[PDB]
Structure formats: structure tokens, C-alpha cells
Design a protein around this ligand. Structure first.
Ligand SMILES: O=C(O)Cc1ccc(C(=O)[C@@H]2CCC[C@H]2CC(=O)O)cc1
Ligand SMILES: O=C(O)Cc1ccc(C(=O)[C@@H]2CCC[C@H]2CC(=O)O)cc1
Lengths: 226, 227
């Protein structure tokens, strides 16, 4: 196989997708083949489609998904309101593992955060990450509260021996501001900060987003990913 | 001693103070002597003073602070930015043990979320709860994000055998939308939900707030907090 990263966030709206896109883009630009798997998508009622954002921003075509729920809520809650179970632990793991292939970076995007139920029964992105032996790249914010949320997340990760491939700040504010500037220093004392995506990065066109992405991550880290 | 409860949250701005005040108020009305403790207060240059708020809302006069930093930031950053050091682990613990007393509910309101550093090095409210043998009451929101945040907090508490006293939804909308309602249902499956304070509970005057506080909590749970 190749390298499987699960991409998780410290919450929702923290920039998970724009981060998958950005690393997919950067790794594509290093001649790495990228697949992005979003097993469970929610909020399709209002048009959430993270795989499509990825395809648009990053030109990834191996965009793989299992289920889509309309309600913009947690996967189990959306599934509840819709009357249909979540996927199985088995389809998630096998879907990801079949994606995996040597020379390919396979990015697995969760829904919300690390412990929200993704499959039946009660199985989380952390379990998935375990099952496929993937590290977790953690998307974090720059705002007040990120340090707790990040400490909590890395703790949860360590608890099941899921390695941490670092943090990405989903949205770097401009101007940074006292808190954000502080948090970036503080966050790097906890884990490697692979990039800080500028605020507004999700609105860029493909060509701009590609430039952004290549400039966002350390080139060697990216190339050293597979 | 009596009963010590650290009050944490899944984050910041989730309603730790209002809950502190609300549980204080419900406890006082049950005839329980309440002290509220805020070992680390940041944002004092903003006017942030949670003890003052808890005093204002619940009429608690047994308020006990230790460290105050002016900038509204994490204690560590607030401390560093002001040229100050964080308290030591035992300074916080000493403040709490000095309030602890039989028949008293001592509430220790954290700063931000459970794993915020309160004292050098990396000492958190979780560690403080081990030191004073306090259970933790987790203040959560009803909003998108919360089930992951609550599970992270509870897992983090269980990692140090810090028992969970339950959850309080710090702001509960009326009416509740699909998300809020579904979040409440799932929250109650994770732990006991001891109250859901109505949104804008902080704008209630003293006797409105005390009325809200008495209804918000199960009298039996409150009464059983202190012997
Ligand atoms: O942990 C919790 O209870 C909260 C929670 C968990 C997952 C999600 C979602 O999947 C969101 C639904 C609308 C956008 C989408 C964004 C995303 O996937 O992060 C939202 C909230
Ligand atoms: O980012 C992290 O996790 C660390 C962090 C630590 C403390 C705080 C605070 O204390 C807030 C700062 C201004 C109000 C105040 C409200 C509160 O007491 O939580 C916020 C974040």
C-alpha cells in the first residue's frame, strides 16, 4: 500500500476540507497521486459536498464516499432523523484500504471531530484510523479554545496509539491578532504545525488554491509523506 | 471536608460561569453552604470577573480567587503577556482545601476547557481535581461540535479517574431546533445531563435567576451533592 492519513478536526467548521484540499493539492504538485475518501458526508440538504470542494480546489479525481445525509448534524443524528443506519465499520475500512495503493496519498476526512460516530456501532474515525494503521492530521483553529480542543484531541489520539502527523490551522486570520499569534506558538509546543492556511483560502479558484497549497506546506514533509 | 466540584466546560464561552452561579443558587436554596472558587481569571483588563458574576447572579459571597491576568487569553499567554507567572499547583490546591468544609459545596470554576494549563508546568484543572478528589461537572453547549467535545472531555476525565458529575447545557434555546434537540438526546446518552439552563439566563435578575436555578436542576441531585 501507500500512506493513509485520516484528517480530523478539533470541531466543525475548522477547515478540515480546505485542509484536505490543500494537502491533496500540495502532494499532487509533488507528483504524488492523491485519493480523498469522505466516508460519511452530512449537510447535503444545504449543499455540503466536501469531496466536490476537494475536486474543485485540488483536482483530485479519486473522491470516494459511502453515505450522504441531508441534515447538517452529526452522522448518527442525521442518520437518526433520516431513519437509515450509518455505514458499517467494514465498508469504511475496506473502502479506505482499497483506495490505498503504493505511491498514493489517501486522505480520509471525518465528519466533525475525532470521536463522533461514523459507522455502526459507535465506531469513530479514531477506530478507523486504528484499523487502517493511519496517522491523524489534526485541523485546528487559531482562536480562543483551540489549545484545550487540541490537547484533548491529541490525548484521544494517543489513547488508542494513533500517531499524530501534526496540526494544520484551518484558517489563519489576517491580521493575526493577539490570541491567534499566541496560539500558533503555543500549538507548536504541542505538535508540529504543518501549515496555517490563510483565511479565505476556500474561496480561491483552483489555480490560486494550488499556489497557496504549494506555499503552505513544507515541501520535504509533503514529498516525504509517501 | 465537604463536597468539591470542579466545573469545567467543553471549551470557552460555553457557560461555565452561569452554570457555576446556577448550581450555586440551586444549592443555596437547598440550604447548602456554597463557596465558588476561580483559581485563574484571565481577561481582567476586559472586565472579566467570573466570581463577581457568580456573586451577582447567585448572591454568593464566599468567592475566592487566586491569579488574575489582564489579557483575555489562555492563562499561560495572559500570564506571559503581563510579565507574570502562573500559580503553582499547590497554590490552587491550597485555595480549594482552605474553602473545603463539611456541609459546603465548593465549586472550582476552571479557565476554558479541562486541559487548559492553569499552573506551571502543564498543570490542568483535571490534575487539580485529582489533588482535591473533586468530581468534574462538564458544561457543554447544545451546538454543532458538542458531542465530540463532550466525549473528548469525558475521556480526558476518565483517563485520570476524575469522575464525571454530569453535564450542564449552559445555553438552551426556546424553542430548540433539530440540532439542539438531537444534541440534547445524544448528550444524555453520554452522561447524566443535570440541567439545561435557558438561553440568556445571565440576563435574569437575582430572583428570576434563583427561580430559574431551582427549576433547572433536580432537587434530589442538588441535595445529594453535600452531606
Ligand atoms: O460533534 C458533534 O456533535 C457535532 C458535529 C459533528 C459533525 C458535523 C458535520 O458533519 C457537519 C454537518 C454540517 C457540516 C458538516 C461539517 C463537518 O463535517 O465537519 C457537525 C457537527
Ligand atoms: O485555547 C485554549 O484552550 C486555552 C484557553 C484558556 C483560557 C481561556 C479563557 O479563560 C477565556 C479567555 C477570555 C475569557 C475567558 C473565559 C473562560 O474562563 O474560559 C480560553 C482559552
Amino acid at each position: 500500500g501507500g500512506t493513509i492519513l485520516v484528517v480530523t478536526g478539533t470541531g466543525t467548521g475548522v477547515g478540515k476540507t480546505v485542509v484536505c484540499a490543500a494537502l491533496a493539492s500540495a502532494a499532487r504538485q509533488a507528483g504524488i497521486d492523491v485519493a480523498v475518501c469522505k466516508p460519511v458526508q452530512t449537510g447535503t440538504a444545504r449543499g455540503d459536498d466536501d469531496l466536490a470542494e476537494v475536486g474543485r480546489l485540488a483536482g483530485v479525481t479519486q473522491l470516494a464516499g459511502l453515505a450522504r445525509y441531508p441534515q447538517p448534524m452529526a452522522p448518527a443524528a442525521a442518520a437518526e432523523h433520516a431513519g437509515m443506519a450509518l455505514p458499517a465499520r467494514d465498508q469504511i475500512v475496506r473502502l479506505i484500504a482499497d483506495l490505498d495503493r503504493p505511491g498514493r496519498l489517501t486522505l480520509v476526512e471525518g465528519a466533525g471531530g475525532l470521536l463522533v460516530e461514523l459507522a455502526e456501532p459507535g465506531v469513530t474515525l479514531r477506530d478507523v484510523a486504528v484499523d487502517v494503521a493511519a496517522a491523524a492530521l489534526v485541523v485546528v483553529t487559531a482562536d480562543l479554545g483551540t489549545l484545550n480542543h487540541t490537547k484533548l484531541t491529541l490525548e484521544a489520539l494517543a489513547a488508542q496509539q494513533v500517531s499524530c502527523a501534526g496540526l494544520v490551522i484551518g484558517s489563519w486570520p489576517d491580521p493575526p491578532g493577539l490570541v491567534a499569534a499566541s496560539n500558533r506558538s503555543a500549538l507548536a509546543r504541542i505538535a508540529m504545525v504543518r501549515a496555517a492556511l490563510p483565511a479565505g483560502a476556500a474561496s480561491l479558484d483552483a489555480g490560486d488554491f494550488a499556489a497557496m497549497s504549494a506555499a503552505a506546506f513544507d515541501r520535504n514533509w509533503v514529498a516525504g509523506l509517501v
